[PDB]
Design a protein around this ligand. Structure first.
Ligand SMILES: CCCCCCCC/C=C\CCCCCCCC(=O)O[C@@H](COC(=O)CCCCCCCCCCCCCCC)COP(=O)([O-])OCC[N+](C)(C)C
Ligand SMILES: *[C@@H]1O[C@H](CO)[C@@H](O)[C@H](O)[C@H]1NC(C)=O
Lengths: 87, 51
């Protein structure tokens, strides 16, 4: 967790150690008391509300990614299809 | 109402409507179900069906 808003991530690699790879995810955040256009994860996060349901973790434990799946709840109406809704 | 799935509760309820229509057709079609009522007066062509 950096202190400024600027970081200079590098990677050194020798000719032999060329296959070495990484993949990161940098996320902007502000102080605790968030507002509109900002979602609040705890421990000093004000990630953008676009980052909620982004499909990626933009925090700690996946808090931005929850209650974001809604399909259907039914009984025999769930199976009006090639299941027993034909029979 | 849970120990049978809600397609079985529909298949049972369609079976009661199924078999009772099958039983009513066969009872009117079968010539042995048409018994003769009035055993006190056993001479009349008034054979009945209770189904
Ligand atoms: C006047 C006419 C009279 C007839 C109709 C009167 C109305 C009747 C009233 C109500 C209707 C009957 C019950 C309600 C609806 C059916 C429910 C059902 O699930 O289907 C059932 C039967 O249907 C089939 O799936 C076909 C199976 C082929 C063989 C069936 C024998 C019939 C032929 C007779 C052979 C001659 C025998 C002669 C003596 C030896 C079984 O379904 P399933 O396939 O097992 O399920 C798949 C299982 N799976 C999901 C795990 C894969
Ligand atoms: C951050 O803010 C808005 C929410 O107001 C969000 O929808 C958008 O994707 C983001 N915009 C930028 C420029 O990062």
């Amino acid at each position: 967790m950096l202190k400024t808003g600027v970081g200079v991530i590098r990677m050194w690699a020798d000719e032999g150690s060329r296959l070495s790879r990484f993949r990161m995810l940098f996320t902007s955040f502000v102080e605790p008391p968030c507002t509109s256009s900002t979602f609040f994860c705890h421990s000093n996060m004000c990630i953008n509300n676009s980052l909620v349901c982004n499909g990626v973790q933009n925090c700690a434990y996946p808090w931005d990614e929850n209650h974001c799946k809604e399909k259907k709840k039914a009984g025999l109406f769930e199976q009006i299809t090639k299941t027993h809704g034909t029979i | 109402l849970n120990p049978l799935s809600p397609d079985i509760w529909m298949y049972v309820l369609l079976a009661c409507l199924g078999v009772s229509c099958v039983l009513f057709v066969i009872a009117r079609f079968s010539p042995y179900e048409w018994y003769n009522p009035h055993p006190c007066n056993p001479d009349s062509d008034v054979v009945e069906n209770n189904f």
